[PDB]
Design an enzyme around this catalytic site. Structure first.
Site: not given
Ligand SMILES: O=P(O)(O)O[C@H]1[C@H](OP(=O)(O)O)[C@@H](OP(=O)(O)O)[C@H](OP(=O)(O)O)[C@@H](OP(=O)(O)O)[C@H]1OP(=O)(O)O
Ligand SMILES: O=P(O)(O)O[C@H]1[C@H](OP(=O)(O)O)[C@@H](OP(=O)(O)O)[C@H](OP(=O)(O)O)[C@@H](OP(=O)(O)O)[C@H]1OP(=O)(O)O
Ligand SMILES: [Zn+2]
Ligand SMILES: [Zn+2]
Lengths: 335, 191, 191, 335
Positions: D40, D44, D47, D62, D150
């Site tokens: 990913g 922010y 990943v 992460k 979110d």
């Protein structure tokens, strides 16, 4: 002047035997030999200890420094003709670096101690034995029509542990052709025969016998080198002070040679000195009367009056060595 | 004092890896085998090296003069190659290595191990000169442009290796630690 | 056209390994975390990068103005480190690697493999910047003085390694040939 | 405004449960986890797929991008309080690079297909199942006094092969404290509830139910995103064109809120559109009358009038899913 023995060896044998300049250079696989470390730092060729990658048997690698292609072929041809011979270093292969064609000769592994370090520890018997073993090599190469022409301590390798002697570095060796005139710039200064010093170019195998005599004198008298000249002219002066000038004049008159007046002035006039003069309490154990008679019969101005290698082996000095060799082969035939 | 061709040459930018080949070695006409042929200008290139006033050096145009310099350069380079191999030249090179004249390894993991000069092949005009780091045991390119252009055959694939066993003590032990390929503190998982 | 601090900086001798970090990334006040502290003259360095007319840039003496440039450089370097890691910055670095702006491996057996810039640690003033060759997989020092002095943390031990799994196709296969220690054509004895 | 359910969770529980700013950061061994590849590319945090060097079990790494230390502690504290929960991503460890202290969260391995690629191939039953599984996660976190804030396709990971759903990325999650006014800069644009768009800061768990409704509408109607605003103001306009403005005015009047005149001009006046308007032959198989009733009860301006996660799970739309899960429990209890 013609040699007293083995005169026509190269006249009898075919052109292919002595025609080294036309030798075919069949190189082997340089990949088959791996270097381990340097050993000899001679400036004609560098010496290294190596191994055969397959058999893993050790070997000596002698890398030749740029000389005329014919000089390389001369050493190889001579090594091939003498290969296998008694106490002759055995050439196993000839290889070169695949891109620069830098040649290397592959020999059997030596594992010797140099003459200078070893001889102070040798008994009179060990001296006779090794001199006898060297004579076997000289008689062999002379019988094959070849003169070593560089007889000296460094070129005689001895593994005292195994009692093995090998005559190495045949870079200066040459074929003997009767009546041929050779270059006199051969042998190391201290071992040069009178023939080289007076320009007698038609010398022969007897040159090696003079060099052997110089080595022998240095050994039994413990004086290295025996004839210590600072240059080529002084070398003859040093010899003349021992052998005498009357014998030199007789030799010069016999071969119709005459020295340059400057050299004759240097030599001057001297009496023959007996070999007993050089004996001292420190070398007495090595100097027997047979040793003196043997040495006297080698160090003669007249090359034709010096002992041949065969005649030298028969001298009474080696009676004990010959008897021990005959007794060894009897006790070894039973065991 | 007028610096002889040999002594002067060594001070040029990039051409410092060359030891002063003794005059005693050049006047020894025996080492000059092979070179007597493959190298053009041979007598006028060797006259320039010994700084002897040439019998026809005066008679050359600007065009011939520049080329003699380049021939003496190729010559002295191949001369240097054979001198560094002899027991005499081996000693002379050691001193330049002591004062790190042959640089230090570009690989970080070799700490700062000095290197030895070596040509990709003992064959002229075929390759530029490279270096050998004894610690990692691999070969690299020089650090300056002035060094990275010079022909390598003027050293050959023989000297760095000869220097190794000649001075066994100088052979350094391998890298203390190993390179850690880390992304964010985590090693690259290779299966 | 007036070259902004970003565009101008990249053209300085040795400092070319820096991509133009987008204004859209500097005006994104979120990435500026941490830098907000450790960075000297924080605001004056950021006014300088964006080329904004400072409210006191007039009264700043020779000694004061000089320090603003040194603060903006260090800052832009640490800015560059985080930008090259984002998917946006990753693309921009790829282009400089395509036009071999990050040099080529000093190891001869790397067949002319270009390298990636990387600092010995993601920690400022602790280390100079080094390179990584993907073919050999080891790390080296730069080729020019102007490159070999710059702090490496301005890239970090994260980017060249990120570039590796981002562009899998660029990962070259290992060296076909290896170094052969030959002295006169004879392999060295490695028992 | 206060939540209809789970209102006092963080008043009942001790300060240590919700006081994330005072959390002790007990880091693990970064050496225990080895990276494999990126997955990913969120800005922010990045990943990666990794493995635990010891167990060799796969995992998700992460890596957090420089944010306020309290934001890191917020996500960790929430992950710790919800760890183990149904369909909640499981945090296994928290480590950092030993020199730069760059933090990384270690989760269980996902192995999912992203929502965008997968949903075009889902049956109506599979949609109900996954929505139900997501509701289980929402009811759990809401029961623990936490709002995800979110909710969106990217944050719902589905391994369709194993029928496993996980709600990931709790970076925006926050503890619900009754009456508290929160920041409205949360959720992705297309999933922002009216409360965020009209500055009702004292919102609650019901915000997630709006986001779920947006996702649900996008799925059954095959329109991604369902409310496609080009900016935050246009987002409210897009919503008003479907739900109607009369209901918006009633909601604004109820909570004593008033829109900025420029925003009120943009909204204009529109009638409520029935959900049937959005049906077409390509999405008919996914739109049942129960689906429409369920969606209508989620997409309401008034957050207090939206279904809770518990109420949503009980809807007739999920009757088949509940019957399949209750049949699975009987079969799993015997085997
Ligand atoms: O036998 P040659 O073919 O006449 O060549 C050798 C020598 O070369 P080799 O080592 O290959 O035998 C010289 O050749 P280069 O090194 O110059 O190639 C050569 O030099 P010149 O061409 O200047 O004559 C020299 O010639 P010379 O006999 O005139 O001295 C001559 O010497 P040798 O005949 O004594 O071996
Ligand atoms: O040490 P700094 O890098 O200067 O960090 C601080 C600090 O943030 P952290 O405690 O998370 O490190 C404060 O954050 P809050 O308590 O307001 O959340 C706040 O301190 P100041 O009131 O002293 O400025 C400010 O962040 P903000 O401006 O969002 O309030 C920020 O300092 P900087 O403004 O210098 O980055
Ligand atoms: Zn090294
Ligand atoms: Zn490399």
């Amino acid at each position: 002047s013609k040699a007293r023995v083995y005169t026509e060896v190269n006249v009898i044998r075919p052109k292919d035997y002595w025609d080294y300049e036309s030798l075919i250079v069949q190189w082997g696989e340089q990949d088959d030999y791996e270097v381990v470390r340097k050993v000899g730092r001679g400036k004609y060729s560098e010496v290294f200890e190596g191994i055969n990658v397959n058999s893993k048997e050790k070997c000596i690698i002698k890398i030749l420094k740029p000389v005329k292609k014919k000089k390389i072929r001369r050493e190889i041809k001579i090594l091939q003709n003498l290969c296998g011979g008694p106490n002759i270093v055995k050439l196993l292969d000839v290889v070169r670096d695949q891109h620069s064609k830098t040649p290397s000769l592959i020999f059997e592994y030596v594992n010797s101690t140099d003459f200078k370090v070893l001889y102070p520890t040798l008994t009179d018997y060990d001296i006779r034995y090794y001199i006898y073993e060297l004579l076997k090599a000289l008689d062999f190469c002379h019988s094959q029509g070849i003169m070593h022409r560089d007889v000296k301590p460094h070129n005689v390798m001895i593994d005292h542990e195994l009692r093995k002697l090998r005559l190495i570095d045949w870079g200066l060796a040459e074929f003997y052709h009767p009546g041929k005139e050779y270059n006199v710039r051969v042998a190391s200064r201290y071992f040069k025969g009178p023939e080289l010093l007076v320009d007698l170019q038609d010398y022969d195998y007897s040159l090696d016998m003079w060099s052997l005599g110089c080595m022998f004198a240095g050994m039994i008298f413990r004086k290295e080198p025996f004839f210590y000249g600072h240059d080529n002219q002084d070398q003859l002066v040093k010899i003349a002070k021992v052998l005498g000038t009357d014998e030199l004049n007789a030799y010069l008159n016999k071969y119709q040679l005459e020295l340059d007046p400057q050299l004759e002035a240097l030599v001057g006039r001297h009496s023959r000195k007996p070999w007993s003069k050089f004996i001292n309490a420190d070398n007495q154990h090595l100097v027997s009367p047979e040793a003196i008679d043997f040495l006297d019969k080698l160090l003669r101005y007249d090359h034709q009056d010096r002992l041949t290698a065969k005649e030298a082996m028969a001298h009474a000095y080696f009676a004990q060595v010959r008897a021990a060799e005959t007794s060894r082969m009897r006790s070894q035939a039973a065991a | 004092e007028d610096t002889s061709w040999i002594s002067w040459f060594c001070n040029l930018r990039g051409n410092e890896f060359f030891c002063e080949v003794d005059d005693d070695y050049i006047q020894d006409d025996f080492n000059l085998c092979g070179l007597s042929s493959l190298v053009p200008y041979y007598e006028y290139a060797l006259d320039l090296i010994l700084d002897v006033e040439s019998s026809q050096g005066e008679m050359f145009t600007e065009e011939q003069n520049e080329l003699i310099e380049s021939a003496a350069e190729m010559l002295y380079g191949l001369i240097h190659a054979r001198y560094i191999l002899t027991s005499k030249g081996l000693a002379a090179m050691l001193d330049k290595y002591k004062n790190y004249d042959f640089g230090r390894c570009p690989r970080v993991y070799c700490c700062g191990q000095p290197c030895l000069p070596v040509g990709q092949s003992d064959l002229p005009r075929s390759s530029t000169v490279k270096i050998y780091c004894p610690k990692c045991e691999d070969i690299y390119y020089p650090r300056s442009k002035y060094q990275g252009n010079i022909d390598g055959a003027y050293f050959g694939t023989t000297f760095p290796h000869l220097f190794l066993m000649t001075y066994g003590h100088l052979k350094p032990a391998k890298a203390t630690q190993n390179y850690v390929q880390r992304v964010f503190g985590f090693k690259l998982h290779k299966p």
